[PDB]
Design a protein around this ligand. Structure first.
Ligand code: NAI
Ligand code: NAI
Ligand code: CXF
Ligand code: CO
Ligand code: CO
Ligand code: ZN
Ligand code: ZN
Lengths: 374, 374
């Protein structure tokens, strides 16, 4: 009754930066070859989406944002083989073509078909399946799940379990997987180590879960909002410190607390200063610091290279280093096997119509993850 | 005959920066508790010693420099248990106390008892064994090998094989073992990967030897001195580029050549610009870049954190990551077993009196290592 036809539905359009989302009707074109149309079930409010509003992350406007979601396939285009109509799926904001130099690498994950390095804000064929008021609406990261119906390329969606709580497992599309994978797959947190986590939101808490799951003896969470310490200690943080509660540079404090530096530090905020700070506080000869936060656009940090020369390892990662299409189904299947918990990340659950409310909440500090259930 | 006595010998004292070494007689005190007085046989001229002269590496002046050496123990002091009088040893500019948390970690090697981070230019007890002209003379990295006799702390020296050619294995004391281990231990280069090496001096060529021994498929040598290309090809470099031999950024050129970026890149120069360039030229999703060169002192680089978020791993290392007191006897035993060659590194041989002429060979570019004989 809808396959092969234009679907008229509501979406959250962003016409310009630093303005709230306009909840209006959009025209969703039917899926083309190797494309998939998804009926959204639940979507998360990631800071990454807020970065598009604030101008921190630059992508073509106007746009339908969102990338943390899980829906059910409405219709598939010609040549789609990995998902069928009626399958539960998760949009992958990092694709997995399987044919490129990174996808074939056994330990690489930033597939080259991504729309992040140089945002084109379209499908793979370079066109927009979205229309609002007759104007075409750009895509976001190949997902654009801030809509009741979206279209993704087959490389940007994975099939998850048919018996999946779609209102929880949507966090596996981004927030949880990024933080958990950064700790387990990127940093490679060892048993008994000391970990520092800068930022205690959805991704930062997920990092903490990964470190505790990896057996970290100490997990020091850092945030300038102490209202976040409670949740952090719930999921594994052994101590929480507030840089504003220190007279000297936070890194010096953590060097003391760790008796010479932490084994693994994580920047999970998106500031240049914290990125260098988080690298500074890990052990100068065998420490590892992982950047997870998104920096401001086109904008450099200044850092003493002699901080690496002593033996430090500094690395970043997209989506926790997880190969998206291989891993997102494995994580959904692990979550239901009670391998880890997603519920500690969900603080608010709202109607999609109240999407500017869940965003106002993230900018005031009151939320970790606001799920939007369609 | 001289045990427990003050010894007069020639030494190259550096009085002020950017000045020639002054061959003067100096009073070498006898060894103290856990100290070893060593007679020098051969010492190499490292670019690090020139950093002291130029001011690139700030260390207390006046100083007796030198850290590449091999010699024979004059005498030991009370409580020394690892080296007897007259054993062939190598001073370790990176000590291995074996009791801090670095020495003791499975991969760390920048022992906290080092004199690099906060150089005081003394022994472990804070005093100088060098008297020249009624003045205490600073040490250098607890080695000060630019002297017919020196006194090193027991944790800064390693007994090596008694049949060792000391005019060759002094390079295991720094130049070779640094570049070699940076490739096989630090970067941990893979079978059949593509390697880029910025800098084709003594340390840069050793990286090539490590890269080749690790099974590299392509080893791209980068140097602005085309006269360095012959020796680089001779030790395993498949190609050689002059950055001044391209119109694009050198990192664009290497990215084309590598079809998307190299697997492993090495900065073996000591320039801020080439550190970032060497990091840019490896694969954004799984490239590894190792800094080996010494940057200008307290001088700061500017790089884009988006280079790391995509996946890139950025690290540095001292002495190729080798635990010094452990590795120097093994590495001298592998040279005995013909498992690598030091002869391609030795381009010049001069007497100790010709130290100033040996430095000008390096400053002129005409040399790899000049080996001073005592
Ligand atoms: N590389 C990747 O794959 C992904 C990157 N990210 C980025 O990670 C970062 C964190 O994501 P979220 O948890 O969703 O954002 P968030 O706003 O929920 O959490 C950030 C936390 O850091 C705190 N903070 C802000 N400024 C601080 C400062 N100067 N010092 C200490 N703490 C400070 C905030 O109070 C907040 O609690 C974002 O920048 C996001 O764009 C998010 C998803 C995946
Ligand atoms: N991290 C560690 O453990 C150690 C660090 N080092 C440092 O490694 C660096 C190299 O050591 P050496 O081989 O002995 O010095 P070197 O002078 O023999 O080699 C440096 C090479 O870099 C080349 N070069 C200079 N500018 C260049 C540019 N813009 N682009 C491309 N190539 C350029 C030079 O032509 C030269 O051939 C030094 O800075 C040294 O202090 C030395 C030993 C141990
Ligand atoms: O060359 C020998 N040692 C070097 C190691 C890198 C920092 C400066 C000193
Ligand atoms: Co996100
Ligand atoms: Co050296
Ligand atoms: Zn791919
Ligand atoms: Zn030690």
């Amino acid at each position: 009754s809808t396959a092969g036809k234009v679907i008229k539905c509501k979406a959250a359009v962003l016409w310009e930066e630093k303005k709230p989302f306009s909840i209006e009707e959009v025209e969703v074109a039917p899926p083309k070859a190797h494309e998939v149309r998804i009926k959204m079930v639940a979507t998360g409010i990631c800071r990454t989406d807020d970065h598009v509003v604030s101008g921190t992350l630059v992508t073509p406007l106007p746009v339908i944002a969102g990338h943390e979601a899980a829906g059910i396939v409405e219709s598939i285009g010609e040549g789609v083989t990995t998902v069928r109509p009626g399958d539960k799926v998760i949009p992958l904001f990092t694709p997995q073509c399987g044919k490129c130099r990174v996808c074939k690498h056994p330990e690489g994950n930033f597939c080259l078909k991504n729309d992040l390095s140089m945002p084109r804000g379209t499908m793979q064929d370079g066109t927009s399946r979205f229309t609002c008021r007759g104007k075409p609406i750009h895509h976001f990261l190949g997902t654009s799940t801030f809509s009741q119906y979206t279209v993704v390329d087959e490389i940007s969606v994975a099939k998850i379990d048919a018996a999946s709580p779609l209102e929880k497992v949507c966090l596996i599309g981004c927030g949880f997987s990024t933080g958990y994978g950064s700790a387990v797959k990127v940093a490679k947190v060892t048993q008994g180590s000391t970990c520092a986590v800068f930022g205690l939101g959805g991704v930062g808490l997920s990092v903490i879960m990964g470190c505790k799951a990896a057996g970290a003896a100490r997990i020091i969470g850092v945030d300038i909002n102490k209202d976040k310490f409670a949740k952090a200690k719930e999921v594994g943080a052994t101590e929480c410190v507030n840089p504003q509660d220190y007279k000297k540079p936070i890194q010096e404090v953590l060097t003391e607390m760790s008796n010479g530096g932490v084994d693994f530090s994580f920047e999970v905020i998106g500031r240049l200063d914290t990125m260098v700070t988080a690298l500074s506080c890990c052990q100068e000869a065998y420490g590892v610091s992982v950047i997870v936060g998104v920096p401001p656009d086109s904008q450099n940090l200044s850092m003493n290279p002699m901080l690496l020369l002593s033996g430090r390892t500094w690395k970043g990662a997209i989506f926790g280093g997880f190969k998206s299409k291989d891993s997102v189904p494995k994580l959904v299947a692990d979550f239901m096997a009670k391998k880890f918990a997603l519920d500690p990340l969900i603080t608010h659950v709202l109607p999609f119509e109240k999407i500017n409310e869940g965003f106002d909440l993230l900018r005031s500090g009151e939320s970790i993850r606001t799920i939007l259930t369609f």
